[PDB]
Specification:
The chain has no helices and no strands. With 17 residues, it is mostly loops. One of its GO terms (molecular function) is pheromone activity.
């Protein structure tokens, strides 16, 4: 339903910015 432990692999952690 949610995917944030993804985020604790990307987005916050990994970004192209």
């Amino acid at each position: 339903e949610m995917r944030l432990s993804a985020f604790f692999r990307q987005f916050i952690l990994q970004r192209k910015k």
